[PDB]
């Protein structure tokens, strides 16, 4: 599969009268899940669990209600796997990948925010055709090209192209010019937006240069960030 961040407290217990929630996001067999854990660090049982996502850039929405049809007892801890889809109300957020969430129990409604790792939103179908890559790279306005440095990374081209493909970032073509390795790479997000990349590897220096061309280039920062976490874990 792709890279999955270890979960992280999203809702501290002290901010929700003992209800602690922690989570991550996954993309497995082309379906997106919010992978949660609820722990009851409160004095009494918790019931009537429910979830709502607010309006967000990628129009992310759960596919079912929260399936925890159970009383959550003190010091009890459970893993919930909430399926998601991107058919819901869209609205460009700041930061672009911030999701506002509200969880309800018998006690109250609690609000929290978390950042969707953009790689879970990369679709299985992001491998551009080479001539189409060529022409599209030529096509995107040239001020829509952005340059990034992948720091202290020591993996070779094969390993980089391998890791990256596990996350639906495709390696279209490979060019070795001047002992510097060059990888051409497309990815497609869930809202259709393409990201084309040229990644540049050179023995000697443990810093990779990442050239991203996207039609909405405000995305590209978040794409690099994801390149960085992928190639570092």
């Amino acid at each position: 599969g792709g890279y999955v961040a270890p979960k992280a407290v999203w809702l501290p217990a002290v901010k929700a009268k003992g209800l602690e929630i922690s989570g991550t996001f996954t993309h497995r067999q082309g379906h997106i899940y919010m992978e949660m854990n609820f722990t009851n660090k409160a004095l009494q049982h918790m019931t009537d669990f429910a979830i709502q996502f607010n309006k967000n850039s990628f129009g992310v929405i759960p596919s079912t209600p929260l399936a925890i049809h159970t009383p959550l007892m003190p010091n009890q801890s459970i893993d919930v796997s909430l399926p998601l889809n991107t058919l819901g109300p869209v609205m460009k957020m700041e930061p672009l990948n911030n999701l506002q969430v509200a969880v309800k129990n018998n006690i109250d409604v609690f609000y929290f925010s978390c950042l969707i790792p953009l790689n879970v939103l990369f679709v299985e179908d992001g491998k551009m055709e080479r001539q189409v890559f060529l022409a599209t790279w030529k096509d995107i306005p040239n001020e829509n090209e952005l340059q990034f440095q992948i720091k202290e990374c020591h993996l070779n081209a094969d390993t980089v192209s391998s890791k990256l493909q596990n996350n639906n970032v495709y390696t279209i073509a490979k060019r070795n010019v001047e002992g510097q390795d060059m990888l051409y790479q497309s990815l497609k997000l869930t809202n259709g937006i393409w990201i084309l990349a040229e990644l540049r590897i050179q023995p000697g220096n443990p810093n990779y240069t990442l050239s991203l061309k996207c039609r909405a280039p405000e995305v590209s920062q978040y794409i690099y960030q994801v390149y960085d976490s992928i190639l570092k874990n």
Partner: peptide, 11 residues
Amino acid sequence: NNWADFSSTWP
């Protein structure tokens, strides 16, 4: 900030 619903009747 109160964007969420959760109403006990809802049909």
